[PDB]
Amino acid sequence: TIGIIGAPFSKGQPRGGVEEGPTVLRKAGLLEKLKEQECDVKDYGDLPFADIPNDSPFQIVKNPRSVGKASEQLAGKVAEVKKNGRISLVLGGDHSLAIGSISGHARVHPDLGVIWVDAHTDINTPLTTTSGNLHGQPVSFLLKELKGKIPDVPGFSWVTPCISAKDIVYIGLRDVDPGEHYILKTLGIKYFSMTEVDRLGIGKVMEETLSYLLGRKKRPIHLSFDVDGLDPSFTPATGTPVVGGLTYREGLYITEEIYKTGLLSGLDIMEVNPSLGKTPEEVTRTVNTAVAITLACFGLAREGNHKPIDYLN
Amino acid sequence: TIGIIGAPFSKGQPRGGVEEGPTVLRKAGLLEKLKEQECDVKDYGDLPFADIPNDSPFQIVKNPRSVGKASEQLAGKVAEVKKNGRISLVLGGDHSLAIGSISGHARVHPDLGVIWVDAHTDINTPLTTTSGNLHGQPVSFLLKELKGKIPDVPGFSWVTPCISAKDIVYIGLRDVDPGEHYILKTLGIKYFSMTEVDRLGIGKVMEETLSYLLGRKKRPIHLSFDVDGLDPSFTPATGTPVVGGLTYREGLYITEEIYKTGLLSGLDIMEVNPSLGKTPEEVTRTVNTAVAITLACFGLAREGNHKPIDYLN
Amino acid sequence: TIGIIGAPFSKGQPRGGVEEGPTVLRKAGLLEKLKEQECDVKDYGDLPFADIPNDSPFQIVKNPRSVGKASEQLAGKVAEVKKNGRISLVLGGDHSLAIGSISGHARVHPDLGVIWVDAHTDINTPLTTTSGNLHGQPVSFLLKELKGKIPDVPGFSWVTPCISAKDIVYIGLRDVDPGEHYILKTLGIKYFSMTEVDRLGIGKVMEETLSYLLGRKKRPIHLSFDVDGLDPSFTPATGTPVVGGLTYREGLYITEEIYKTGLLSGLDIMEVNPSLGKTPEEVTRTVNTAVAITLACFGLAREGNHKPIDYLN
Ligand SMILES: N[C@@H](CCCC[B-](O)(O)O)C(=O)O
Ligand SMILES: N[C@@H](CCCC[B-](O)(O)O)C(=O)O
Ligand SMILES: N[C@@H](CCCC[B-](O)(O)O)C(=O)O
Ligand SMILES: [Mn+2]
Ligand SMILES: [Mn+2]
Ligand SMILES: [Mn+2]
Ligand SMILES: [Mn+2]
Ligand SMILES: [Mn+2]
Ligand SMILES: [Mn+2]
Ligand code: NA
Ligand code: NA
Ligand code: NA
């Protein structure tokens, strides 16, 4: 069963237009298409994110109270969906929302493991960031090993880090800040940058990823999918594109393999910004790619699908 | 030695323009280019497909008598080419013609094995099809295991199924109807959908394909190549394109490997529809890609080719 | 440490515009970007290539004296840079300059091994060439095994072949003349054509390449990188593009792996011709791709880079 949550929120980064991700994904028939695969799909609507007009930067960190609150609300809504026995599907919205999505999920399933598909590690702290954009920091707020390195940023007093360095795998990396690379190598976080993907192939990547996270014991998976993880030729309508990304095929491979574990528990589909398509067709290409990736998470398979009936009768 | 047969036929599907495939492939210098690799290339011309004006649908199956007859004629012509000791090269034309091409081939070489390169399984029956388009059904007419599930469709009383479920390998699949997936899993047909290609790489795919078909004993290969098996970025001028296809490189890899078996016996180059190019360059890109794939089947190798002489003398 | 040498030279082939490669690569901030990775980057300027007005063809070989001289000068400059303890970085310019670059390098490091990344083998002799273009012949001038097959071509009396057939590996091949293929198979030269890359994946390719060249003993590597080795979709602004090339990812993989050997000693970045971009964006795409490949050679890594400091302090 699936619980859809819309998160029309942009203040984790500078470009307007990402708050429209939930609308365009919905207008592409996401809900109807999902119903062709699972009988029980519940749309919990778009979260009403109140304007927080007074929100001056904390040091260089931008819109901290807005970002913190949006994630707090989202965590509550994800925890509710999880309690209702459903897979949470978060339509973003910028990637700072993963703070809420993962935190909420972890309230119900503290043993979850995270697969983070992104060109970026999104693990800057409030102190290592040079942009101040909170969509480049969510992982730092979630990791137990970093608690004493996160300042008390207004808006985030509610956060309790819910994952260890061992509980996350990165796939797709190709634009990692030096401080983030320091944190990555210091904490021993498991990652498959595009170098690894090139070396091993996406087949070996997914085998290793899933062995790593699930080998010891079965536990819930959280897939946090930044559409910028895919090459700009597939998902151009996004805020921080980086060339040499994952292919459309590789994207579906990742999501097909995750689906087949039967352990998908939470999903974020993040950073679709239709306002940044150069043409109407760049928008449609991005949105269609996002929809495809999503459907694969809930069982659409390139080899085909059939219902348990005799089709020759 | 090579025997070229043109099959300018479209009534297996709705879009006009596929009947022009043989002309554009020929105008690209297919014949001359093939002569740079084999001395003996014989053009048996384009088959004269008579209009069959009275051809109402059989249930929802469209143009059944036209399709059946075109394939009957083609089977005769392929059998003739095979008897003349030549590799048959069928220029399509829509993929329903594979009924004729494979049937004819099998009259001379009943032990043939088929490699089917396509985004689609083309294995709907007259009873499972929802489109009624016969280019989505040819494999169902050919398979022995399905004989009792094919109704007596007008135009096809001449057909005798000539292959078993073990005698075919699919490569490229990514848009398989539920009924087709049922048939695929019921009959135990060997396939490499795009998921498999992604998992294993095209190298392992071709090793497995050829081990599967040829391991027990050497026998003739029939390659039925739907240009929609390649991604629309390579072969856009085709009727049923599906994103996330095989690459140009993968296409040449498949055909290079088949060539090197020395067992290529029949070839179909199908579903080029120049009328569907958005631009002149989409047409040329499609036609050039089709020509490349074809030349690779008869020995053009990316590492290079030389004649048995001393070039430093 | 790095020594940059500009080689604004085009007479190894017919198209003007390649002499501008060094300028556009420099205007893209190549030098500044390299300084973000190594403290000591020295620009030795552009070589002043004097016009040689009287330069009639030798048989069909074009501009032989111009090409020979440009390479002689370049060899001198590379040998100087090498003596100064620096990695030579040659900005081309057409690929005939590899005669000079490799020869110069070998004067200081006779044990070097060459990795040649190209759609072409560039190993025609003055006698096997059909174009007469000297950028299709440089390897033939360098190989010891061919000495008695190279005529005394005006401009090249200074050359002494400095590498054996065992000392070179080709990656990317896909348009090899028959005579070149004869030489390739006769001399037993190690190569990974696009067929091999497709078969094995770029991961296995680089493992095999580097095992082959370095397994016995560590020695200096010379990377001669023709941008036409990458697919025209990545590096369109070049004189002899060939479809089905290496990807942008594969290009960075090759160069990342070479970097990590710590044995990179000489680098050529060749055949960027901005005059051949169909649009300003084709030029920028080509130049940016060339710059990326170069930065990867000197340590820019897709997983990230950090300096030896504590970033959480
Ligand atoms: N590391 C940069 C880029 C972050 C981009 C965030 B993302 O992955 O969600 O698009 C920053 O800290 O601003
Ligand atoms: N399965 C669909 C699509 C078939 C397309 C056929 B083909 O592979 O030859 O393009 C149908 O039965 O119509
Ligand atoms: N083999 C052809 C093409 C050579 C192209 C050279 B190159 O790799 O440097 O672009 C010739 O001899 O002219
Ligand atoms: Mn992100
Ligand atoms: Mn990102
Ligand atoms: Mn087909
Ligand atoms: Mn098809
Ligand atoms: Mn070259
Ligand atoms: Mn070349
Ligand atoms: Na992003
Ligand atoms: Na087709
Ligand atoms: Na070139």
Author numbering:
A (entry chain A), B (entry chain A), C (entry chain A): 7 to 319
The authors write:
To study the structural basis of the alkaline pH optimum, we determined the crystal structures of the Arginase-1/ABH complex at pH 7.0 and 9.0. Upon increase of the pH from 7.0 to 9.0, the Asp232-Oδ2 atom shifts away from MnA2+ and towards MnB2+, and thereby forms an inner-sphere metal coordination interaction with MnB2+ and bridges the manganese ions more symmetrically. The side chain of the nearby Asp234 also moves upon increase of the pH, resulting in a stronger coordination of the Asp234-Oδ1 atom to MnB2+, while coordination of the Asp234-Oδ2 atom to MnB2+ is slightly weakened. These results indicate that the manganese coordination structure of Arginase-1 is more symmetrical and forms stronger bonds at pH 9.0 compared to pH 7.0. Although ABH binds in similar fashion in both structures, a clear change in its binding mode is observed upon increase of the pH from 7.0 to 9.0. The boronate anion of ABH is rotated with respect to the manganese ions upon increase of the pH. As a result, the coordination distance of the ABH-O2 atom to MnA2+ has lengthened, while the distance between the ABH-O3 atom and MnA2+ has become shorter at pH 9.0 compared to pH 7.0. Moreover, the ABH-O1 atom adopts a more symmetrical coordination to the manganese cluster at pH 9.0 by shortening of its distance to MnA2+ and lengthening its distance to MnB2+. The more symmetrical coordination of the manganese cluster presumably underlies the increased activity of Arginase-1 at higher pH. Since there are no considerable changes observed in the orientation or the interactions made by the remainder of the ABH structure, we expect that this more symmetrical orientation with respect to the manganese cluster is the reason why ABH binds more potently at increased pH.
Arginase-1 is a manganese-dependent metalloenzyme that catalyzes the hydrolysis of L-arginine into L-ornithine and urea. Arginase-1 is abundantly expressed by tumor-infiltrating myeloid cells that promote tumor immunosuppression, which is relieved by inhibition of Arginase-1. Arginase-1 is therefore an attractive target for the development of new drugs for cancer immunotherapy.
